[PDB]
Amino acid sequence: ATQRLANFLVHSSNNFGAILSPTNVGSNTY
Amino acid sequence: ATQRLANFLVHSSNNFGAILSPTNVGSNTY
Amino acid sequence: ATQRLANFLVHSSNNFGAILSPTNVGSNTY
Amino acid sequence: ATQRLANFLVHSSNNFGAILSPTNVGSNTY
Amino acid sequence: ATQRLANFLVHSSNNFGAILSPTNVGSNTY
Amino acid sequence: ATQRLANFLVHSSNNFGAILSPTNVGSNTY
Amino acid sequence: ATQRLANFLVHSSNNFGAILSPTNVGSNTY
Amino acid sequence: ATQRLANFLVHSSNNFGAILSPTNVGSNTY
Amino acid sequence: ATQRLANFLVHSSNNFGAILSPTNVGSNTY
Amino acid sequence: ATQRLANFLVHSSNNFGAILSPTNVGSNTY
Numbered sequence: 001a002t003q004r005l006a007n008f009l010v011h012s013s014n015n016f017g018a019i020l021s022p023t024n025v026g027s028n029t030y
Numbered sequence: 031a032t033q034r035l036a037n038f039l040v041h042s043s044n045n046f047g048a049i050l051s052p053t054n055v056g057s058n059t060y
Numbered sequence: 061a062t063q064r065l066a067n068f069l070v071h072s073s074n075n076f077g078a079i080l081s082p083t084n085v086g087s088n089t090y
Numbered sequence: 091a092t093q094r095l096a097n098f099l100v101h102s103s104n105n106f107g108a109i110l111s112p113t114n115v116g117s118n119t120y
Numbered sequence: 121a122t123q124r125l126a127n128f129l130v131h132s133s134n135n136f137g138a139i140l141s142p143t144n145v146g147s148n149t150y
Numbered sequence: 151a152t153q154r155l156a157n158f159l160v161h162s163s164n165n166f167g168a169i170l171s172p173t174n175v176g177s178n179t180y
Numbered sequence: 181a182t183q184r185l186a187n188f189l190v191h192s193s194n195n196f197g198a199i200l201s202p203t204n205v206g207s208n209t210y
Numbered sequence: 211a212t213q214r215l216a217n218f219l220v221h222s223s224n225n226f227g228a229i230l231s232p233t234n235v236g237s238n239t240y
Numbered sequence: 241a242t243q244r245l246a247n248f249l250v251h252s253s254n255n256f257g258a259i260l261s262p263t264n265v266g267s268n269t270y
Numbered sequence: 271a272t273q274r275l276a277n278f279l280v281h282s283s284n285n286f287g288a289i290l291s292p293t294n295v296g297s298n299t300y
Contacts, residue, residue, distance in 0.1 A: 001168075001198035001228040006037040006067075007096040007126075007150040009116045012222045012254060013043045013103045014192055017110050018211040018241035018271075020047050024054045024114045026039045030067040031168035031198040036067040037096075037120040037150070042192045042224060044074045044162060048181040048211035048241075054084045056069045061168040067120070072162045072194060078151040078181035078211075091198075091228035091258040097126040099146045102252045102284060103133045104222060107140050108241040108271035114144045121228075121258035121288045132282045134252060138271040157186040157216075157240040157270070159206045164194045174204045187216040187246075187270040187300070189236045193223045197230050204234045217246040217276075217300040219266045223253045227260050234264045247276040249296045253283045257290050264294045 015022060045052060075082060105112060135142060165172060195202060225232060255262060285292060 001031050001091045003033045003093045003198050003228055005035045005095045007098060007118060007120055008037060009039045009099045009118050010224055010254060011041045011101045011114060012224050014190060014220055014222050015045045015105045015110050017047045017107045018213055018243050020045050020050045020052055020110045022052045022110055022112045024041060026056045026116045028037060028039050028058045028118045030037055030060045030120045031061045033063045033168050033198055035065045038068045040070045040194055040224060042072045042194050044160060044190055044192050046076045048078050048183055048213050050075050050077050050080045050082055052082045054071060056086045058067060058069050058088045060067055060090050063168055070164055070194060072164050074160055074162050078153055078183050091121050093123045093228050093258055095125045097148060097150055098128045099148050100130045100254055100284060101144060102254050104220060104250055104252050105135045105140050107137050108243055108273050110140050112140055112142045116146045118148045120150050123258050123288055130284055132284050134250060134280055134282050138273055151181045153183045155185045157208060157210055158188045159208050160190045161204060162192045165200050166196045167200050168198050170200045172200055172202045176206045178208045180210050181211045183213045185215045187218060187238060187240055189219045189238050191221045191234060195225045195230050197227045200230045202230055202232045206236045208238045210240050211241045213243045215245045217248060217268055217270055219249045219268050221251045221264055225255045225260050227257045230260045232260055232262045236266045238268045240270045241271050243273045245275045247298060247300055248278045249298050250278065250280045251294060255285045255290050257287050260290045262290055262292045266296045268298045270300050
């Protein structure tokens with residue numbers, strides 16, 4: 001059992017409210 | 031069992047409310 | 061058992077409310 | 091059991107309120 | 121059981137309020 | 151616009167690999 | 181726009197590897 | 211825009227490796 | 241924009257390794 | 271923009287290693 005993972009960015013959330021408008025953006029390139 | 035994964039971005043959510051308008055955007059390129 | 065995965069973006073959700081209008085957009089290119 | 095992980099950035103959250111507009115951005119490159 | 125992790129940056133949060141607009145940004149490179 | 155939701159459990163995922171065998175189980179009752 | 185939500189449990193994930201076998205279980209009751 | 215949420219438990223994750231077997235359990239009651 | 245949230249417990253994570261077996265449990269009651 | 275939050279407990283983490291088995295437990299009551 002082997003895994004090779006190239007460069008990355010990791011995040012996580014939960015969010016709740018009366019009004020939600022989180023902005024999440026990313027434009028990564030190979 | 032082997033896996034090779036190129037560069038990536040990972041996120042996760044759950045969200046709830048009276049009004050939901052999260053913006054999620056991404057335009058990655060090979 | 062082998063897998064090769066090129067560059068990618070991954071997200072996940074569940075969302076619920078009185079009014080839902082999440083925006084999800086992406087325009088990735090090979 | 092072996093894993094190789096290239097350079098990365100990791101964050102995590104939960105957030106809630108009356109109005110949510112967190113900005114999360116990243117544009118990492120291989 | 122072996123893991124090799126390249127250079128990285130790690131952070132964590134929870135945040136809540138009436139108005140949330142945290143900015144989180146990063147543009148790391150391989 | 152009104153919604154009434156009784157007690158519940160919520161989860162979400164994405165998963166991938168060479169071999170996948172996640173177990174998800176639940177037996178809730180009214 | 182009004183929502184009423186009874187008692188609940190919320191979680192979220194993404195997971196990946198060579199072998200995946202997460203266990204997720206719940207048996208909530210009304 | 212109004213929301214009423216009863217007692218709850220919230221968590222979030224991302225996890226990855228060669229072998230994954232997280233256990234997540236909950237049996238909440240109304 | 242108004243939100244009312246009853247008593248709760250909040251946590252967050254990211255975790256990774258060769259072998260993952262975190263235990264997360266909760267049995268809250270209304 | 272108004273929020274009312276009842277009594278709560280908040281924690282956060284990130285954890286990683288060769289073997290992970292954190293225990294997180296809670297059984298709060300309304």
